[PDB]
């Protein structure tokens, strides 16, 4: 049997979306609970996750959870979207959320490492610090060249959690420069938008379409819900 | 030869030591090529690892490999010490470099996540940027508190690649503040050194001792060679 999975989450961040993708790809059974910035004050820092009150957060095991309850002592609390991706691959081995070959598992984890050390820093300096679009586009060149040039997904022919880790990021990057919502340099957003639609990113376009076609994306991507919450998160930042 | 392991390594840096600990714990057959961290052989970048020319770098498969040779095209090349650790737990499932339970595996990964996002940057601010010693001790307090208080290793009663990830940092940090070899603020190295010997850090002294008592330390930790290359690296960097 499958012990109980309750995911604490939100829509603006790419990070809960990563977890949902894997959960869907494993045809897992789970419930979701949403979490606001007022939830993290009133009850989610006091009652559920005191250390850092971050989502995403998996509760594995124990009984049915509703909002404002504390997780049972005996259930496991698992933060950190990448660890959770690894946990799901361990929990659902029949789903091959990671390939079986040790070298191709490394290749998946090297892909993710680079999303984290290279793609995310570039996005931050570009969308949040007004950096120039050259830097952003060169990070995207590099990401694209790490894709298998002979086609398929990040680690090769089979979908893996390396795809779950980057795809939420690319979708929101595209949205944020399509809506021009960000702390961009002047005209930076439409430079990046037009380049992502051009031949320089053919391989990446194809990779995005290959991921968006799988039933797991339709099941985890709600344009409006993400947009709504993405715009909001930008205004929070903006204020302060 | 379908299983040959060649490791590009060095002594001063913690990251190749992580891999050696794992190889010894797995009773793996392997060969080492020594890349100098004081005067890096430029054939390493030109013929072996052009992108980043960093150690550790693990060559899996193919024929015998000598210094000043390119690895075979048909062999796998794996950088990133934490990826290599996971790679070796997958190569050697019977060694149990990770526990079998998914929650305990997540526990190990979480522990490592914390070494990476809290301990290393604290060490960096401290050893490289001359930051105050109490900030460094605070990251050490937190590390110690994440250990099982009764005894045992990072993730439980069994050794795991999470001990392989943190033990080389701990050893070199001790050595570094004991010889005051670093860009420390006046009097900050002795504060940390004396606090590491005091009853505040007794649980952590235990952890280091328990790890050092395992055969894998004697087989991987040559303190005189580490110190020679660590001092030589530091003096070179200072002169610049
Ligand atoms: O999921 C991660 C991310 C974590 C990490 C997080 C932040 C950081 O700066 C570095 C590493 O390292 C790991 C180490 C592992 O053995 C397995 C893992 O799944 C991870
Ligand atoms: O070893 C790592 C570290 C890498 C990482 C590097 C920098 C960073 O900020 C976060 C993660 O992420 C991972 C993700 C995985 O699924 C498995 C892994 O072994 C790793």
Residue numbers in the entry:
A (entry chain B), B (entry chain A): 3 to 242
What did the article's authors report about this structure?
To further explore this issue, we have conducted biochemical and crystallographic studies on the interactions of six GSTOs from T. versicolor with chemical libraries. The six TvGSTOs (named TvGSTO1S to TvGSTO6S) used in this study are representatives of the twelve TvGSTOs that have a catalytic serine, while four others have a cysteine instead. In this study, we demonstrated at the biochemical and structural level that T. versicolor GSTs that belong to the Omega class interact with polyphenolic compounds found in wood, and in particular with flavonoids such as dihydrowogonin and naringenin.
In order to determine the structure of a complex between TvGSTO6S and a flavonoid, several candidate molecules were chosen for soaking experiments. Among the trials performed, one was successful where the droplet that gave rise to TvGSTO6S crystals was deposited for a few hours on a surface previously coated with naringenin (chemical structure in Supplementary Table S4). The structure of the complex was solved at a resolution of 2.3 Å. Each naringenin aromatic ring stacks with its symmetrical equivalent in an energetically-favored association (−13.64 kcal/mol calculated by DFT). In TvGSTO6S, the naringenin pair fits the apolar environment formed by the neighboring aliphatic part of the side chains of both monomers (L84, V85, R111, T115, E118 and T119) while a hydrogen bond with E88 stabilizes one of the flavonoid hydroxyl groups. For the first time in GSTs, one structure revealed a symmetrical ligandin site (L-site) filled with a pair of interacting ligands. In the case of TvGSTO6S, the L-site can host flavonoids.
